[PDB]
Design a protein around this ligand. Structure first.
Ligand SMILES: CC(=O)N[C@@H](CCCCNC(=O)[C@@H](NC(=O)Cc1ccccc1)[C@@H]1N[C@@H](C(=O)O)C(C)(C)S1)C(=O)O
Lengths: 221, 214
């Protein structure tokens, strides 16, 4: 059981600085080089920084984009890999992976999201996506929650505290023109259950400590 | 740096089929090439190193090959768990560069979408914005044309789409289109309609509501 357990990251303003941490366990950390690799949202993988073992003088190598702004470092007594990130720019917004390539394996951390923006965190507004009573009487009906105007990523959505999973689609977040994210989550249900069964979407936005439950009902006039 | 180009960038295949992806480097890389599988929302998983060495635990149906600049990964008989994005990695000279990635998805039959339209909530309108949401549920292939018609007028520049990854049970996609309008513009109109063109439909399908009527 090899683990690279990552810590740190989050929201930070441009020109600011941040330090990422990675705790290695279950392999001979000290003999192997360690790396950080980036994945901008929806885009490709890119190498960030490399550092070799004591046996190679802890030689450090950097991508050109970060050469004089980031520093990779390691503490072999504590099995810790670090990335000190200074003079941050918008284009550094990415998921950052701690990576160890060994003799016969390559291990990836779970990643830590870094968002480089001056904006403060903003919790979502959750609005009902409600089916009007046009729904085919013996067929399927759709309802959902619109999870709007939050920052930064991510949000999670469940339905009836996880009891409702079948037919659920929670869409990838969209970056709106306002610069805030927005997403919908929907579920299809028997049209016979509108009015008789109860549907609650549970929205969680950790960066803002927001937890919102919204009951979605058919609507009335 | 060394440049790594992958082909094709995406592809569909059926279960049991033999799949081959290629990976071409701008220069000789001495078989220092590695292949990774990434499933959505997960971290990469290492599959092959030194062009053809399997990492312990990777099924034998996975095979890699090549030399010089031209390399390939091959899945002898595709299985459901093999879907995802595959990256190749040149690690001969630093900076170690990745390919653009090959998206592998599973083929299935055409499926027409269930279409639903959702008016803006009264709650949302209290804040001065109106979002109108159109849902295309459980369809295949991914390509779909959605147009918004407000009082018979096409909309441009005020709508965004988002599409799920292939469903793990029926390999379909779902899409949401969100039309954003001011409360002022929204209340100046009656008929909000969503028009869906798709290969699983003989003719376009439309779902609509009239602002105001239950
Ligand atoms: C004591 C001493 O001197 N050590 C040196 C580092 C070398 C230590 C042993 N070497 C490795 O584990 C290498 N691993 C592979 O070839 C297998 C592989 C490749 C790709 C995917 C999966 C498996 C290379 N190691 C990386 C690196 O060196 O950055 C690499 C070049 C990216 S792969 C040191 O610390 O200087």
């Amino acid at each position: 059981q090899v683990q690279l357990k990552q810590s740190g990251g989050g929201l930070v303003q441009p020109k600011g600085s941040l330090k990422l941490s990675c705790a290695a366990s279950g392999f001979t950390f000290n003999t192997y080089a360690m790396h950080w690799v980036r994945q901008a949202p929806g885009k490709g993988l890119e190498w960030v920084a490399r550092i070799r073992s004591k046996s190679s003088n802890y030689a450090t190598y950097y991508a050109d984009s970060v050469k004089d702004r980031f520093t990779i470092s390691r503490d072999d007594s504590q099995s810790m890999l670090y990335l000190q990130m200074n003079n941050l720019k918008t284009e550094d917004t990415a998921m950052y992976y701690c990576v160890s390539i060994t003799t016969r394996f390559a291990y990836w951390g779970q990643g830590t999201l870094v968002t480089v923006s001056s904006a403060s965190t903003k919790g979502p507004s959750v609005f009902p996506l409600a089916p009007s009573s046009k729904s085919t009487s013996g067929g399927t009906a759709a309802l959902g929650c619109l999870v709007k105007d939050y920052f930064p990523e991510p949000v999670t959505v469940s339905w009836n505290s996880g009891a409702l999973t079948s037919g659920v689609h929670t869409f990838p977040a969209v970056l709106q023109s306002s610069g805030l994210y927005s997403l919908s989550s929907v579920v299809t249900v028997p049209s016979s259950s509108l009015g008789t069964q109860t549907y609650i979407c549970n929205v969680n936005h950790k960066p803002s400590n927001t937890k919102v439950d919204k009951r979605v009902e058919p609507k009335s006039c | 740096e060394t440049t790594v180009t992958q082909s094709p960038s995406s592809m569909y295949a059926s279960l049991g089929e033999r799949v081959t992806i290629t990976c071409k480097a701008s220069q000789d890389i001495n078989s220092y090439l590695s292949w990774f599988q990434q499933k959505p929302g997960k971290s990469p998983k290492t599959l092959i190193y030194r062009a053809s060495r399997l990492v312990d635990g990777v099924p034998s149906r996975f095979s890699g090959s090549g030399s010089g600049q031209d390399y390939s990964l091959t899945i002898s008989s595709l299985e459901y768990e093999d879907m995802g994005i595959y990256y190749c990695l040149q690690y001969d000279e630093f900076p170690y560069t990745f390919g653009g990635g090959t998206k592998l998805e599973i083929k299935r039959t055409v499926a027409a979408p269930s279409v639903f339209i959702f008016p803006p909530s009264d709650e949302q309108l209290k804040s001065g914005t109106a979002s109108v949401v159109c849902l295309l549920n459980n369809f295949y292939p991914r390509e779909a044309k959605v147009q918004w018609k407000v009082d018979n007028a096409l909309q441009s520049g005020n709508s965004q789409e988002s599409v799920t990854e292939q469903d793990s049970k029926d390999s379909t996609y779902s899409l949401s289109s969100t039309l954003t309008l001011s409360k002022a513009d929204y209340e100046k109109h009656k008929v909000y309609a969503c028009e869906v063109t798709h290969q699983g439909l003989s003719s376009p399908v439309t779902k609509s509501f009239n602002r105001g009527e239950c």
